[PDB]
Point group: D2
């Protein structure tokens, strides 16, 4: 037997950082969960009990805090690139670092219509994420994403004209509820190293904001022929607005809301045009994916 692949490191490292403006008294907080996994010439720790090649996972944890102390933590694409680069430069025998960051929302509170200097609210479990792969001699690959964005529209969704055979019971419809949890990922062109990532810093927050806006607007305005058709429209627009993105991937559950036939009870009408009360279904759910790239 032989080691074909190996990676190890520290997961679920929670980190908070505060920035204090002395001039204005305004404070800004950031909170993330970080995972760092390393690869390189470490096979002997598995095969020969040779720990001399192991940077302890405990040390990886220390490094994350030290790096957060000495560097900006935003945008997360930059912080992840700094963190991954550190490991491949510091250790001769480590050749790849894989950094995953989940950013948690702490939105400044408005009190009496004024932004509060140091109080924050968690408005939704929506996350902004990055995956950064730093590979020695091959640059920096960054995937940025948003996840946990939960939306619903109560009309202007249709689904008809699908394949019908002996397995099909689903009725065609011209008016249904559409609800999903959005997971959207945009993959950046490969960067040559940290200097190049730094050169594009302003694009990261702007592209996140654009991706979010395009997702929300398209969902709200499309008279949707299917999840497939609406998601493609979203991806097409993001690619048009940011030339440095190579691909956009969406993964969308179709969270079903079923009509409830109440006609057995005093002829009560609650289906089709008379449908008012529905039963949200926890499971099963449709799952629709697509990856869109350039011609």
């Amino acid at each position: 037997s032989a080691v074909k692949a190996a990676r190890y490191g520290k997961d679920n490292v929670r980190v908070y950082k505060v920035h204090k403006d002395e001039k204005t008294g305004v404070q800004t907080v950031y909170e993330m969960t970080v995972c760092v996994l390393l690869e390189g010439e470490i096979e002997t720790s598995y095969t020969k009990a040779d720990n001399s090649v192991i940077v302890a996972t405990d040390s990886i944890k220390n490094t994350i805090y030290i790096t957060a102390k000495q560097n900006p933590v935003t945008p997360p694409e930059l912080f992840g690139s700094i963190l991954g680069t550190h490991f491949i430069e510091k250790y001769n025998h480590i050749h790849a670092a894989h950094v995953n960051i989940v950013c948690h929302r702490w939105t400044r509170m408005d009190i009496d219509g004024k932004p509060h200097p140091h109080s924050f609210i968690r408005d939704s479990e929506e996350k902004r994420n990055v995956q950064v792969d730093v590979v020695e001699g091959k640059g920096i690959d960054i995937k940025s994403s948003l996840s946990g964005l939960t939306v619903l529209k109560s009309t202007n969704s249709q689904f008809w004209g699908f394949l019908r055979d002996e397995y099909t019971t689903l009725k065609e419809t011209w008016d249904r509820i559409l609800s999903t949890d959005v997971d959207a990922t945009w993959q950046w062109k490969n960067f040559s190293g940290l200097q190049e990532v730094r050169s594009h810093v302003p694009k990261f927050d702007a592209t996140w904001a654009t991706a979010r806006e395009v997702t929300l607007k398209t969902f709200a305005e499309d008279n949707s022929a299917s999840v497939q058709a609406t998601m493609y429209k979203m991806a097409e627009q993001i690619l048009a607005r940011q030339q440095l993105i190579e691909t956009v991937e969406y993964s969308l559950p179709n969270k079903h809301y079923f009509e409830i036939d109440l006609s057995w009870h005093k002829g009560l009408q609650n289906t089709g045009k008379n449908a008012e009360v529905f039963a949200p279904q926890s499971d099963p759910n449709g799952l629709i994916k697509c990856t869109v790239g350039r011609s």
Copy 2:
């Protein structure tokens, strides 16, 4: 042996309702999870296998949908009172109904600064809840609550002057992070029945809004001497603003963020006045409760 207490019914009944304004084209959605438990002369179903006294839990589920079809579902205090009253009036041998409702957020989307007519977003897992106990001959007891409101302030919290003995390691502090998940419940004066609940309908949404506002403002503005002292200020204000509330109860975790001493690494300064990077602690957590009533 004897049956000392018994209750049974249906839990986790998910319900969605849409309202469609034909004049404006605007749609509004409501989504809840409902639990209904009944009590009454049902002991024989346990002791003698006498099912004749059982209103099937499946029928309770049907009733929830039918009731939602025929009545407004907002405010939830009203819907819960209608639902509970139904069971005690319809069935001679059922003498109490206990209705719990959790309301989920579906907030209308703003697209290009305009409210969208039929598209919604789940902005946070914060819930609005009610517990309604309808007891034959004793009226309607309603407890309203908000839960899952997660907040953090980065300064203007202190904790000093506590008891110190041989069990104490905690250092006094004049500047710390304070973060919590708010669970706040206000208990209404007993209502004589449905007519009286109907007479107070406008107070329900207004009092929820007030409770939320007072919680957020007091948290943001108090230079907090402790969780205990700040929560009492909140409760005092809610009681002052709504005479029909008898008691206010808060249950607050103290979600700790620990300083990280980095001085072992090149004398890096990250404690006290130099603290920038902290470690959020998943557990354990302080838990502080209080119930405030009128003199």
Copy 3:
């Protein structure tokens, strides 16, 4: 306004303890999650920002570890009583302690048919719990429970003869699946203090074991007329076997498995006597409770 009730302390304190037999080399592990909440003359911490009355929640955490170091942690009824008694005796102004303990399973591994001296497996998320209320001048009240015991029987459950009216669609049945998650609590007679709890130590593990055995056997062997009827049989037996128990409470979800009509597809028969494939339902669920005491 006035403080009507207040309690505070530390929740989610995870504790592991190992016992090492030097003679045999055998090791035994215990892992728990502990919550301690205190009450007493502490109103001024809420109303006057008087922290001098507060035993810091951090100190409560320290106390839990120190107490676990100096005392046996099993049975949990004893450990909880020691822990609660500590607070009311040590602090003049603390008059009640409320201790909740959740015990996690670490079952010794069998390797080649022999019990291993120091290796353990988590066989199921079933928990053994205690709630201990220690109140100055009123003794020690203990509620013991098991929870998270998930069972299913594929036949020998019936449900017919229930009330039928205009809200009823459920068909009567003489053969169905019955599945539940068992939550069972037995409440001990009040104990005068720690000496009396110590005197009954052997009864705690024995009664837990009996409660579990009676639950499993009755579930498996009863040709069940309803959840109500089967649960009553369980409670009756536990009360008969342990005279020091005053009441037994069961809370049981009815986790539904629905038949799937497949007759639309080539006349496939999958209902009633031909039912083989079913759809487990995540929600809603029946919820049936009862508390049984002595005549």
Copy 4:
């Protein structure tokens, strides 16, 4: 823009099946959660709103139940292969099916030392899983796994001799707790189609059983030099015992239990050789992975 990849289908389809032996009266239950995602010539549903190419996800759900009705559901490697093959053969334009199955434990109850004919218990959340990829013209690729196997050993784990630099605070140790949740996957050699999968049916359950046994025994008996070294020993043995496996992958968290220094309190000794009470850490955790193949 162009569609680079697309797949869609139904997730979270819960299925239960009962087998009834008429001769013995013994019943056996199976419960799974199934996901099926399809690929093929479906790009136009995304780009042109052409639903004619879509096999509705609702129909995929129906198919899963019908297939379970007409075929054995065990071993899951066989059921997944039957299910995936169905879609690529039935639909000309579907060229790949991806089937994921999670099998839930329902272990027959022992009542009075005898196996019960129709009563079952969920002994642990450990799962047995399969991933089956059926690709037209390329055969059947099967990955089998176990997950959610949670173990702990209280001694006979060491960790010393790792890299020490200016980022390192971890002390070397010759005696620590080791606890993990095992995720282990074995990948079968490619099969040419369903006939070949059928020919190897007895190997599936046997290899699962072997993988489990080797994992438990090696964990219990190895005087572990690191997670890395112990996991490699496991993988090596599985590959030696089943020639039809090509690779074995383990992914193991290192769930830390920290010593608690109590010496500040009356010189209490609770570290090193005197360590009895520990604090389990919820996060962060080490994460160690490896994939082992043949020379």
